[PDB]
Amino acid sequence: TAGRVVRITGPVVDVEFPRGSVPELFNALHAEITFGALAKTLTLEVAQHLGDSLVRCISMQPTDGLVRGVEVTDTGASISVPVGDGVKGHVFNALGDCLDDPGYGKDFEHWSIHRKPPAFSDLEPRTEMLETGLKVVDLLTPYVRGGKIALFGGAGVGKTVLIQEMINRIARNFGGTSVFAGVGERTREGNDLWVELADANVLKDTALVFGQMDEPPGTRMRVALSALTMAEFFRDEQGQDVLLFIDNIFRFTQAGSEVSTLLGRMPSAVGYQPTLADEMGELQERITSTRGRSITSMQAVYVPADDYTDPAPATTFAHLDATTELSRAVFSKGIFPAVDPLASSSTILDPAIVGDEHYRVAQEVIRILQRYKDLQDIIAILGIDELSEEDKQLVNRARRIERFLSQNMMAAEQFTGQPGSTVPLKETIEAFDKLTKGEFDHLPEQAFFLIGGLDDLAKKAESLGAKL
Amino acid sequence: KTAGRVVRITGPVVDVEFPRGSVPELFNALHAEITFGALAKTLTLEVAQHLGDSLVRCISMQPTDGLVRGVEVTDTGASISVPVGDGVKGHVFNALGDCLDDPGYGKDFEHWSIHRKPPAFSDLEPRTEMLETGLKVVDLLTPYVRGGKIALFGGAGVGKTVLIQEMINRIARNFGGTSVFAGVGERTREGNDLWVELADANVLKDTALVFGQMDEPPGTRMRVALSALTMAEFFRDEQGQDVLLFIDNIFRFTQAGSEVSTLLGRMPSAVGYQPTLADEMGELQERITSTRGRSITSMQAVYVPADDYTDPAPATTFAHLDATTELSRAVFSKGIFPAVDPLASSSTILDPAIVGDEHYRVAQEVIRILQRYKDLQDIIAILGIDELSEEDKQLVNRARRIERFLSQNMMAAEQFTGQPGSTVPLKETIEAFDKLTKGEFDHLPEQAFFLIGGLDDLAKKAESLGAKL
Amino acid sequence: TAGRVVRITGPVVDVEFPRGSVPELFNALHAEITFGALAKTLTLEVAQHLGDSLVRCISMQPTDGLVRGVEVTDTGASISVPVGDGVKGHVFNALGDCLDDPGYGKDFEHWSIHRKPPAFSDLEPRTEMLETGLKVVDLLTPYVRGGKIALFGGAGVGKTVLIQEMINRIARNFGGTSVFAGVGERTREGNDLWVELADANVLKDTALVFGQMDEPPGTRMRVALSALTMAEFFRDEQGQDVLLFIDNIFRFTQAGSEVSTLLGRMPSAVGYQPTLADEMGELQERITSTRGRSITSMQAVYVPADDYTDPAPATTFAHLDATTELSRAVFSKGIFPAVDPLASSSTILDPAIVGDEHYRVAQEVIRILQRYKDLQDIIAILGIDELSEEDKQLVNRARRIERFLSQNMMAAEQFTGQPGSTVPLKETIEAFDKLTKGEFDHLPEQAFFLIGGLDDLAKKAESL
Amino acid sequence: ASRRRAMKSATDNADDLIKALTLAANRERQAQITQEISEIVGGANALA
Amino acid sequence: YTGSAIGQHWMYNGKHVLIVFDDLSKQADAYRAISLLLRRPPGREAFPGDVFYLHSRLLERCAKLSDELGGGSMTGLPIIETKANDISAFIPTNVISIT
Amino acid sequence: YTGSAIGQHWMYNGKHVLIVFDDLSKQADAYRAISLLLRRPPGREAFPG
Amino acid sequence: YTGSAIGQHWMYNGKHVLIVFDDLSKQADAYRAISLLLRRPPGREAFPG
Ligand SMILES: Nc1ncnc2c1ncn2[C@@H]1O[C@H](COP(=O)(O)OP(=O)(O)OP(=O)(O)O)[C@@H](O)[C@H]1O
Ligand SMILES: Nc1ncnc2c1ncn2[C@@H]1O[C@H](COP(=O)(O)OP(=O)(O)O)[C@@H](O)[C@H]1O
């Protein structure tokens, strides 16, 4: 009844089974690599039924050392991971194996990682602001409790630092459960996060699932599903509020595209798999709060080559309630967090949810920044003296506003030595109202760089000789 | 017997079926016969791939028009070989070693296979001896290396061939060693002009010319460089004689390789190029090299398609060079000859260790001024020079004078303008550009610096214009 | 001898035939969809011979409901459209089926839509000008008889009224006829054009052929050939001057590109079909003057991304002879037709064709209008008073010239009581020469609106 | 008067710059479409 | 097409219908995915050769019927999401030409 | 190539020939069309190598 | 990978290693060439998936 390996080509393995014993799609099969240096048990996932009792499968582990014709065993079910309160405080890989305690969790209940999304009738839109203490996020991209939040950006613009900052700000005081999913990111970052959570004593409430960029495409494709399965158990079964952090969700799509052509799929535009949107929707529609069951999800989304029109981020955009879009231009200016205020968005940034004052101040800030962006090239070529008095005043205000949107972040201390700060939402709204009214135009713009609230502004202005 | 037969013909590429045990080795030469009247000839096919079932895919050196399926194909048992020795000097050959200016000549010479491994890594030694050409821009900003590899990049009609002629005049003329010229996919009339010019200048007696030109099948255009390089290798490794190797154009070798790869059925790489582009280029280039005690100064003109310097061909060629002159369409448009882009060109020996502290300082100051002018072009294209600061205005005037003074009346440019060329000693070049960078000639008009040699020419032209140096 | 469907892949259908009965290329085959909801007769155009007595065909109708193995009939000829005087005043699809009266024209003579251009010796080696009677077109951008004219214009600038005017003029001043080819025709706009031409009473003089937007690419690709076949019959058999309209030619090119993609052919630069130029040439070279009779074609051209170097517009413009830009600014002035005198152009506006005096007058008009356009911004912002007296008089002269470029069209009668006017070319040239000289500045501006020659100008002068 | 002349010159130079940039941008647009199609069709052929 | 059929039932019965498609670009992406998975030849942006047909046959069902058929109407409000305000992309170009 | 061969016949007989190609852009387009119809992989601007 | 293995032998035995890859662009090009010669389906810029 067992199958045998017929073709091996990178992470894709063709397996022939006796007629009537062909495994179902997404079933987990087991093969053996007996070579001493690389001896292991490969988990393959059935991807396609090629016909003639052949199945195309994706290896979860490197196929180096695999031999043609070796026995392949069908487990009869999909990949399944342990679920329950025992996952909290531990590190797992995509297959449910505990890393910091091998063998732990083997006796837990195991849930299949493949699952349909919640029924549409159980979906309730979430409109409740989740305060963070970050000026730019709270003012322009207010996050939603139980909603879907994303941090878009190119390589090395501050997505991981921002995720760590939000773990510090949100998860530390969180009363429920946290799940972190490292998807195709740096192993060193995973170790740093593990140690930092242990230090903050947040780890006991956190389940960490890692599949890193050194893993084959299959692991990077299924790690997000594993972590989401744990989070789904905590949501549906345990009935508790869940935080879900994913970094980086683009790696799921990228891993899908890596094996797409080896599966016989004709490429789509920009070298992506034809089923980009379908797989992304299958994964994302599970990352949601249902009626009375809350998942506040925060996802880092890599934007390939800073191109926000790339198919992957463009498809991802529709699945989010709030989006903080980090910019390489803002980054290179030195502003941190390198948020693009004109590009970021939030579905609860309207007067009904945040109130008239907050909405008006945010809109005025956006208008000033848009006008400054329009005038930037004029200033570059013809100089600022050829602007009108109103335009010059607007430019001064806009420069101060953009500096004040930057903040000394708690997780950025290792990069600046400066301890971080938290600004209450009321103070943020008041300070930016004052800025838009021109009440701080007498201070040097350098006074507004990487500070907290108004008291920090006054102190830094004093250090620079100005008075507030 | 043991001869194969033609089974498939797809332009220059031919599939040949041999009896089992008689499949020729890779790169072996095979002979077929075209018997049709006007096209009757003998085809030389180079084995390129083993397809299995005792089939070999081969690249034809001559056009396959008139070839029939099933004709007998004979295996020479070896690869294409070319004549070598002192006898090749003064004669014109094609890629296969046939003498063109005197058919039958060199058939009795020692013959070397055109395929051989590059020198062992242990025999390689870096070369850093400066080669003084007498061109201001080259000597100052991109000093050439004696025994090193020099390249001249440029789009269509920017002056690559004229600069190759200039360097033949300036280097090969009073040269004690041998010279090998390899025309690779260039104009045939240019080959005839070079032949006649070398005969007139008496340099032909020391030069071996090998031509595979535009109207040749891609196989010939990708093997002629190997043939000429084989003659150069014989002179380097057997007679211990300093060798000059001029190649024009090596991008045509890459292009012919791309055409062959398309015909061979290989899956295309980016921009339609052959997947083995870098590998073929490296295999060719690593053979062009000096070894310990054996010097080859090679100078290759590299064509840049559609002025695109990021095209894979020149992009991979860049890594194989010690000095790289980059000819620019914009500089050419300004009328500056040689149309060298002083900011994109480079030389491995332009460091204070090799060329001295003052040479390096003057070169770096010139480069800094030109870079600042390039930066300011964005402002100047809109508002002109008058919106700049006084420092920037002074720098821009200095930069315009410098870029004009990097031009020169070349020896090979006389045929075009009728003006004899000029040679500038390196010491004078350094002194003159030091004076320019310090603003000692700012009062002279810009045109005083255009297409001249040293400071004496500068004085004469400035006086003729109306300013006194 | 009938074939049978073997493969169905969207609009592409493979058909197997007995060995000795494989249809010729471009032959029209018939198949039947018998499912009740979608029952119809598919027309298949043989595109390729795949071998083994299989042909790859493009379905002219959606293949939904088609079944493998259904019998396929070969008509023995390519797509044939009805021809004759009977096609006037009726609407046909790309296959020659009447839309306003199904079954009409079945008994007319039928011509294959695939025809070759006139032989080389039969072409006219001397270019000729088509005198329309419109001042602006005749003077500034003369039309070429048997030539091609691009029409550019945004919504609501009188493009439809201009087409009606050209239909009127070809029918009345040449004893000719018009064929309208709606390539990628919006059904709403097709119905609007039908009703408007009927109301204007010029529908009797025009034959409409619609390949509509909701059709598979094959009919959108062949509708232009169908209309051109009707026009060729009128030119060759009836000995008439024809005026063929194509809107939009870019949609013909795009339908060809889509057909090429469906047939699995490797796309060319910018993704167009490899044979883009060949198809464009095959279409355009049939619009020519032959043995004293001509087909003149006005063609709406869409320029992708406003990029005139794009392969589609670049290929189309290689065949065009004149350009007529309809300007929103000109229309907003009340000038009709809203032809942009400066954006428009014509390749025969040179001394060798239109003579020295026509060129001289046209160039003077262009210079004056260009100067006025340059001064317009100063006028608008800093005011006329700022301009010098020389500039003021030049502005007055240019305003009078641009008003006189307007004309009371024959298509305007249905909108305004006055009938249209025709202006002989010589009279137009002399009148505009005098206007440029400055012989009518004393007359008021309003005198120059919507009139014909100098007699109308004089009469409106006394009237005011 | 000289400022008027200078601004007229600058506006004309901006016209020329915009025209050249639009030409280059359209060339880049066409090249990108062609390259995307080349990649798509090459992948499809590899799977043929 | 489901929405268009539901609306067409009312339109042919003398009613007036407004249909919003949000967004047609997502439909085009889904159809491209299906066509690629069926190995149909691709064109620009990997779209099949009948994506323009996909959208045109849908949108031409929005019509103002004549009084003979009851005078019902369906008004279409297709929505297209451009990227970087690129209206010259393939699907935006098609839908702009169609509407 | 037809025009070139006709001219070459005269040229190789001591005659002087002037050949005009109007224009080679369209010949390149036709050759590209033939190559793409042959399914030869294209290069820059979809042209054959 | 050879250099990485040599460095890893020292790293796993308590030594500190510094490895320079000069440069990975050419390794990527070589891998693309190998993959194309094996006729594996290419991706962006002909690189393998
Ligand atoms: N130093 C110079 N002085 C004057 N004119 C020159 C000079 N160099 C080049 N030219 C002009 O440029 C033309 C092209 O020169 P050359 O043939 O050397 O260019 P190229 O880069 O080799 O061209 P191609 O791509 O056609 O092979 C020459 O015929 C001559 O007209
Ligand atoms: N708030 C900040 N303050 C100072 N430096 C920062 C900040 N955020 C990011 N950086 C710098 O930018 C780098 C990239 O951040 P990270 O989020 O790790 O990359 P990515 O955005 O690719 O995830 C960091 O290593 C850090 O040096």
Ligand SMILES: Nc1ncnc2c1ncn2[C@@H]1O[C@H](COP(=O)(O)OP(=O)(O)O)[C@@H](O)[C@H]1O
């Ligand atoms: N010569 C003219 N005289 C009077 N009115 C005109 C004339 N030409 C156009 N118009 C008016 O301008 C409008 C333009 O509409 P139409 O001609 O249908 O162009 P389009 O179809 O592009 O909107 C018409 O409604 C018509 O009333």
Ligand SMILES: [Mg+2]
């Ligand atoms: Mg990161």
Ligand SMILES: [Mg+2]
């Ligand atoms: Mg040359």
